[PDB]
Design an enzyme around this catalytic site. Structure first.
Site, PDB file in Angstrom:
ATOM      1  N   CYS A  83     -80.227 -12.702 -49.519  1.00  0.00           N
ATOM      2  CA  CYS A  83     -81.162 -13.290 -50.485  1.00  0.00           C
ATOM      3  C   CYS A  83     -80.980 -12.723 -51.876  1.00  0.00           C
ATOM      4  O   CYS A  83     -81.140 -11.524 -52.095  1.00  0.00           O
ATOM      5  CB  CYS A  83     -82.623 -13.066 -50.050  1.00  0.00           C
ATOM      6  SG  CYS A  83     -83.781 -13.840 -51.250  1.00  0.00           S
ATOM      7  N   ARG A 137     -84.498 -11.273 -54.363  1.00  0.00           N
ATOM      8  CA  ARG A 137     -85.328 -10.167 -53.907  1.00  0.00           C
ATOM      9  C   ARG A 137     -86.045  -9.323 -54.982  1.00  0.00           C
ATOM     10  O   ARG A 137     -86.876  -8.496 -54.661  1.00  0.00           O
ATOM     11  CB  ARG A 137     -84.497  -9.276 -52.963  1.00  0.00           C
ATOM     12  CG  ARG A 137     -84.276  -9.890 -51.585  1.00  0.00           C
ATOM     13  CD  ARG A 137     -83.426  -8.964 -50.729  1.00  0.00           C
ATOM     14  NE  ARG A 137     -82.014  -9.046 -51.068  1.00  0.00           N
ATOM     15  CZ  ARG A 137     -81.098  -8.178 -50.674  1.00  0.00           C
ATOM     16  NH1 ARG A 137     -81.462  -7.142 -49.929  1.00  0.00           N
ATOM     17  NH2 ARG A 137     -79.813  -8.357 -50.999  1.00  0.00           N
ATOM     18  N   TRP A 164     -88.740 -20.213 -54.169  1.00  0.00           N
ATOM     19  CA  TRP A 164     -88.490 -21.381 -55.000  1.00  0.00           C
ATOM     20  C   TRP A 164     -86.984 -21.434 -55.185  1.00  0.00           C
ATOM     21  O   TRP A 164     -86.304 -20.419 -55.091  1.00  0.00           O
ATOM     22  CB  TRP A 164     -89.196 -21.290 -56.359  1.00  0.00           C
ATOM     23  CG  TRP A 164     -88.886 -20.064 -57.114  1.00  0.00           C
ATOM     24  CD1 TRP A 164     -87.712 -19.758 -57.763  1.00  0.00           C
ATOM     25  CD2 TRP A 164     -89.754 -18.955 -57.300  1.00  0.00           C
ATOM     26  NE1 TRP A 164     -87.811 -18.514 -58.335  1.00  0.00           N
ATOM     27  CE2 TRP A 164     -89.055 -18.000 -58.064  1.00  0.00           C
ATOM     28  CE3 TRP A 164     -91.067 -18.673 -56.882  1.00  0.00           C
ATOM     29  CZ2 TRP A 164     -89.618 -16.777 -58.426  1.00  0.00           C
ATOM     30  CZ3 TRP A 164     -91.630 -17.460 -57.242  1.00  0.00           C
ATOM     31  CH2 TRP A 164     -90.908 -16.528 -58.008  1.00  0.00           C
ATOM     32  N   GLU A 222     -78.509 -24.499 -55.224  1.00  0.00           N
ATOM     33  CA  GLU A 222     -78.746 -24.847 -53.819  1.00  0.00           C
ATOM     34  C   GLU A 222     -78.793 -26.361 -53.615  1.00  0.00           C
ATOM     35  O   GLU A 222     -78.329 -26.898 -52.598  1.00  0.00           O
ATOM     36  CB  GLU A 222     -80.077 -24.283 -53.331  1.00  0.00           C
ATOM     37  CG  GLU A 222     -80.108 -22.782 -53.114  1.00  0.00           C
ATOM     38  CD  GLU A 222     -81.488 -22.295 -52.693  1.00  0.00           C
ATOM     39  OE1 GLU A 222     -81.800 -22.323 -51.477  1.00  0.00           O
ATOM     40  OE2 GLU A 222     -82.259 -21.898 -53.586  1.00  0.00           O
TER      41      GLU A 222
HETATM   42  C1  HEM Z   1     -88.777 -16.550 -54.917  1.00  0.00           C
HETATM   43  C2  HEM Z   1     -87.481 -16.901 -55.050  1.00  0.00           C
HETATM   44  C3  HEM Z   1     -86.432 -16.784 -54.143  1.00  0.00           C
HETATM   45  C4  HEM Z   1     -85.215 -17.205 -54.516  1.00  0.00           C
HETATM   46  C5  HEM Z   1     -84.879 -17.817 -55.881  1.00  0.00           C
HETATM   47  C6  HEM Z   1     -84.361 -17.061 -53.350  1.00  0.00           C
HETATM   48  C7  HEM Z   1     -83.053 -17.503 -53.289  1.00  0.00           C
HETATM   49  C8  HEM Z   1     -82.298 -17.508 -52.122  1.00  0.00           C
HETATM   50  C9  HEM Z   1     -81.041 -18.223 -51.967  1.00  0.00           C
HETATM   51  C10 HEM Z   1     -80.281 -18.988 -53.090  1.00  0.00           C
HETATM   52  C11 HEM Z   1     -80.614 -18.050 -50.690  1.00  0.00           C
HETATM   53  C12 HEM Z   1     -79.387 -18.694 -50.063  1.00  0.00           C
HETATM   54  C13 HEM Z   1     -79.878 -19.956 -49.341  1.00  0.00           C
HETATM   55  C14 HEM Z   1     -78.755 -20.737 -48.651  1.00  0.00           C
HETATM   56  O1  HEM Z   1     -77.651 -20.857 -49.244  1.00  0.00           O
HETATM   57  O2  HEM Z   1     -78.984 -21.229 -47.527  1.00  0.00           O
HETATM   58  C15 HEM Z   1     -81.621 -17.278 -50.042  1.00  0.00           C
HETATM   59  C16 HEM Z   1     -81.530 -16.941 -48.719  1.00  0.00           C
HETATM   60  C17 HEM Z   1     -82.429 -16.142 -48.083  1.00  0.00           C
HETATM   61  N1  HEM Z   1     -83.634 -15.699 -48.613  1.00  0.00           N
HETATM   62 FE1  HEM Z   1     -84.283 -15.901 -50.505  1.00  0.00          FE
HETATM   63  N2  HEM Z   1     -85.046 -16.522 -52.261  1.00  0.00           N
HETATM   64  C18 HEM Z   1     -86.344 -16.382 -52.724  1.00  0.00           C
HETATM   65  C19 HEM Z   1     -87.405 -16.058 -51.881  1.00  0.00           C
HETATM   66  C20 HEM Z   1     -87.315 -15.694 -50.526  1.00  0.00           C
HETATM   67  C21 HEM Z   1     -88.471 -15.270 -49.732  1.00  0.00           C
HETATM   68  C22 HEM Z   1     -90.013 -15.477 -49.920  1.00  0.00           C
HETATM   69  C23 HEM Z   1     -87.901 -14.861 -48.543  1.00  0.00           C
HETATM   70  C24 HEM Z   1     -88.543 -14.416 -47.371  1.00  0.00           C
HETATM   71  C25 HEM Z   1     -89.671 -13.669 -47.384  1.00  0.00           C
HETATM   72  C26 HEM Z   1     -86.477 -15.017 -48.637  1.00  0.00           C
HETATM   73  C27 HEM Z   1     -85.586 -14.661 -47.600  1.00  0.00           C
HETATM   74  C28 HEM Z   1     -84.216 -15.059 -47.561  1.00  0.00           C
HETATM   75  C29 HEM Z   1     -83.333 -15.010 -46.411  1.00  0.00           C
HETATM   76  C30 HEM Z   1     -83.589 -14.315 -45.037  1.00  0.00           C
HETATM   77  C31 HEM Z   1     -82.226 -15.677 -46.749  1.00  0.00           C
HETATM   78  C32 HEM Z   1     -80.998 -16.068 -45.896  1.00  0.00           C
HETATM   79  C33 HEM Z   1     -81.329 -17.248 -44.986  1.00  0.00           C
HETATM   80  C34 HEM Z   1     -80.147 -17.657 -44.107  1.00  0.00           C
HETATM   81  O3  HEM Z   1     -79.427 -16.757 -43.616  1.00  0.00           O
HETATM   82  O4  HEM Z   1     -79.954 -18.876 -43.907  1.00  0.00           O
HETATM   83  N3  HEM Z   1     -86.101 -15.571 -49.838  1.00  0.00           N
HETATM   84  N4  HEM Z   1     -82.685 -16.943 -50.908  1.00  0.00           N
HETATM   85  C1  LIG Z   2     -84.833 -23.388 -47.794  1.00  0.00           C
HETATM   86  C2  LIG Z   2     -83.412 -23.204 -48.403  1.00  0.00           C
HETATM   87  C3  LIG Z   2     -82.845 -21.783 -48.223  1.00  0.00           C
HETATM   88  C4  LIG Z   2     -83.733 -20.673 -48.837  1.00  0.00           C
HETATM   89  N1  LIG Z   2     -83.828 -20.812 -50.318  1.00  0.00           N
HETATM   90  C5  LIG Z   2     -84.754 -20.334 -51.150  1.00  0.00           C
HETATM   91  N2  LIG Z   2     -84.626 -20.612 -52.464  1.00  0.00           N
HETATM   92  N3  LIG Z   2     -85.804 -19.598 -50.691  1.00  0.00           N
HETATM   93  O1  LIG Z   2     -86.905 -19.336 -51.376  1.00  0.00           O
END
Ligand code: HEM
Ligand SMILES: CCCCNC(=N)NO
Ligand code: HEM
Ligand SMILES: C[C@H](O)[C@H](O)[C@H]1CNc2nc(N)[nH]c(=O)c2N1
Ligand SMILES: C[C@H](O)[C@H](O)[C@H]1CNc2nc(N)[nH]c(=O)c2N1
Ligand SMILES: CCCCNC(=N)NO
Ligand SMILES: [Zn+2]
Lengths: 410, 407
Positions: free
Chosen positions: B106, B109, B278, B283
């Site tokens: 992610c 973070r 968000w 994406e």
């Molecule tokens: C608030 C803004 C956030 C942004 C901009 C963000 C952005 C991202 C992005 C771009 C990815 C890659 C998604 C993909 O290519 O499938 C990702 C994956 C991930 N995010 Fe974040 N994220 C945010 C919030 C969160 C939150 C609230 C959580 C959980 C509490 C989180 C947990 C994760 C996890 C576990 C992954 C990997 C999921 C997978 O392996 O398919 N993210 N995030």
């Molecule tokens: C739901 C698409 C993968 C997670 N992306 C994201 N921006 N999470 O907040």
């Protein structure tokens, strides 16, 4: 243990058995992955097993494993080692080894071309002037007036570690870099330190934006010596855009021959510290990295201005827009001048077919995804969606420390 | 033991020690790196509970305090007797936040400490789950001003009473394989779209039909529910220059909400824990729209831009890609819906890494996932070395229910 690799865009699944022959370490452990880390005198004792492993691979590749020729060679080498602590490769083994170090280079996307490699045996060289001559001939053969041919020149192997042959230049052809008193840099920022060494060694620098650096060659562990590569031998391409007539005024140009000169080639446990090699460029090396890396020519802004892009906020993606045009230009100029170059779509599509071919006929293809995926438009190229397994096979090309950090000046 | 991480664009070096607390495996070995692979008992439980409680108390500066010791024994006794335990709301919140903090894939973070946690552990039915989810969606959407959130359903017990959200994300578009042999909608959801169809759903057979939630409570068979349209914020995609863009008839939803993962806190497993933040523009614009196995719209967009699609070396795919992504971000910003571009997001991640190294001694990060799908090296993360390792609490992958459920 068989390993499965999947392509998430085509669901094609492949099986890897090749890794079972891997011996060197990767830098990773079952608890941590160092996959994005750039950099994670032998003994008679350790040498013969390395030689045996190699000669076995060699004799098996020609279908003479077990032959008398194979057995004799093993005894010959063995005796030689106990007799001299080292051994000399036959020409056939050298060509084979060189081609396979390339075949095994997991960070190289151009491996489909691995079996086409001109090998120049420079093991009879003894002086820097000698090295200079061999290198000029490599550059000329390789450039082939724009129709590039893959080549490698191999100088004498390491002996006691005090007589190494080395090409101090990281690449045979690169532009000088100069740190100005006001903190700005003229030319290529990546080469500022090396450029300082050349100047100190006596080079008279024209202090321009695209000055070709002099070769700094070290033979038999002696202090390195300077040599200017005949300009008529250095092929260059003026950069212009097919639609933006102002592009040419940016005053940009680049050399057509990419020749890595700072790596170490290991074959049968033998170490070839000077082994300059070259293929041809993939456009993004120049257009994305050399021109747009913040620490290189960093031209995005200026190109951005000329295009009159909204540079107030990153979300306009002005940087991304200028990046594509710059790369369009580099590819355009090279094709117009009939200088071999390959775009990132072609190159990756080809690597994918090469890779599949390799799993089928070889049982695998070690590949470093981090390096294989192009520096722009990653996911719209097939390699982005391809799972890859990275492991080390020999023969191979290895990094070695920069000579200015280890050389004992005479 | 003390690993170093270098940024090749800025020469800054950071030392990592956090990895020394890693416990799970990576898939890699000293002989092979699987860094690019997508998916590399009471006795077992107490130790996990102890590791967790230890770090929790340490985080509140009460390490080795009576409260710490007391709680350790309570849970201890609770496991011996109940073969499991329950987290105090404080622990639940701390754990969920740290699972996010530990999500090495992610990039967003830096926002980790601001997470709204909805404790749905008292839920008992699919309708109950639907109510909790609608509430989550509404809260998180906030009329466009997105707020990060997670809703945590009942923990696993004996594995035969698991709660599961069958959708992969809360809001996705349906996909149907037409007679033509082509695919209508999102090719990625063809299999799910069918399980709904077959389960009872009545598909409008459109290109952007919001799928229905398929909730599973306590192990029972899953039920369907249509999310109130007024709760699903969508964005019509138009270009800030190419008036013809709109005619492509493209739109995307504003709330990205992963719902198929497993949240592990101190040994307990929550198989239904939908979470959302968000979007980072790429994406949608790069992956959802341009992947050949997704909406695959490059050609179309290239054609309308009248680019030479004869030779790949003209970089038409690249040019269009840029416009498509400029449109996506444009629209979102126009409709005041939260979105972040890859430049801004990656810049944030670098800043977060620096905070994590100086405040925690490291930050697990998977380079392969952190580097954006386009313009890789012009983002700072491209030049940043990253060490990947697994810390707990964490979000883990789990089998698609329809390949484990006994109807
Ligand atoms: C608030 C803004 C956030 C942004 C901009 C963000 C952005 C991202 C992005 C771009 C990815 C890659 C998604 C993909 O290519 O499938 C990702 C994956 C991930 N995010 Fe974040 N994220 C945010 C919030 C969160 C939150 C609230 C959580 C959980 C509490 C989180 C947990 C994760 C996890 C576990 C992954 C990997 C999921 C997978 O392996 O398919 N993210 N995030
Ligand atoms: C739901 C698409 C993968 C997670 N992306 C994201 N921006 N999470 O907040
Ligand atoms: C035929 C044309 C070839 C193409 C198009 C090609 C392309 C590339 C590219 C794009 C890279 C990444 C460079 C970087 O980011 O710095 C690379 C790396 C590499 N190539 Fe090739 N290559 C070719 C030929 C060769 C040849 C002839 C050899 C060996 C004999 C070779 C060995 C390597 C090695 C060892 C690396 C990684 C170098 C490093 O770690 O710095 N390549 N190649
Ligand atoms: C094969 C390879 O692991 C795969 O294509 C990965 C690469 N990096 C990624 N990065 C992100 N953020 N999301 C993805 O789905 C992927 N896919
Ligand atoms: C930190 C990271 O490993 C580093 O920036 C790598 C990423 N991938 C690369 N890939 C290629 N081809 N060349 C490079 O120099 C790099 N640099
Ligand atoms: C000279 C740049 C690094 C290697 N690249 C290459 N295209 N080799 O042929
Ligand atoms: Zn690894």
């Amino acid at each position: 243990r068989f390993l499965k690799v999947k392509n998430w865009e085509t669901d094609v699944v492949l099986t890897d058995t090749l890794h079972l022959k891997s011996t060197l370490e990767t830098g990773c452990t079952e608890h941590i992955c160092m996959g994005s880390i750039m950099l994670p005198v032998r003994t008679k004792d350790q040498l013969f097993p390395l030689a045996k492993e190699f000669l076995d691979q060699y004799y098996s590749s020609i279908k003479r494993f077990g032959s008398k020729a194979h057995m004799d060679r093993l005894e010959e080498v063995n005796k030689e080692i106990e007799s001299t602590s080292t051994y000399q490769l036959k020409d056939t083994e050298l060509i084979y080894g060189a081609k396979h170090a390339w075949r095994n280079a997991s960070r190289c996307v151009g491996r489909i071309q691995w079996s086409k490699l001109q090998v120049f045996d420079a093991r009879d060289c003894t002086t820097a002037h000698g090295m200079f001559n061999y290198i000029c001939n490599h550059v000329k053969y390789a450039t082939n007036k724009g129709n590039l041919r893959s080549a490698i020149t191999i100088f004498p192997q390491r002996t006691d570690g005090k007589h190494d042959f080395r090409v101090w230049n990281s690449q045979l052809i690169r532009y000088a870099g100069y740190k100005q008193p006001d903190g700005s840099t003229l030319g290529d920022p990546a080469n500022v330190q090396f450029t300082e060494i050349c100047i100190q060694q006596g080079w008279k620098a024209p202090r321009g934006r695209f000055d070709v650096l002099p070769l700094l060659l070290q033979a038999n562990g002696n202090d390195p010596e300077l040599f200017q590569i005949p300009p008529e031998l250095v092929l260059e391409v003026p950069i212009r855009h097919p639609k933006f007539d102002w592009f040419k005024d940016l005053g940009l140009k680049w050399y057509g021959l990419p020749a890595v000169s700072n790596m170490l080639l290991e074959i049968g446990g033998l170490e070839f510290s000077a082994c300059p090699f070259s293929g041809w460029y993939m456009g993004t090396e120049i257009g994305v990295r050399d021109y747009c890396d913040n620490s290189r020519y960093n031209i995005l802004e200026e190109v951005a201005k000329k295009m009159d892009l909204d540079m107030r906020k990153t979300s306009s993606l002005w940087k991304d827009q200028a990046l594509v045009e710059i790369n369009i230009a580099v590819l355009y100029s090279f094709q117009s001048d009939k200088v071999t170059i390959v775009d990132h779509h072609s190159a990756t599509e080809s690597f994918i077919k090469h890779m599949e071919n390799e799993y089928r006929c070889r049982g695998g293809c070690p590949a470093d995804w981090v390096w294989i995926v192009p520096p722009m438009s990653g996911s719209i190229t097939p390699v982005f969606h391809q799972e890859m397994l990275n492991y080390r096979l020999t023969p191979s090309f290895e990094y070695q420390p920069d000579p200015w950090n280890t050389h004992v000046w005479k």
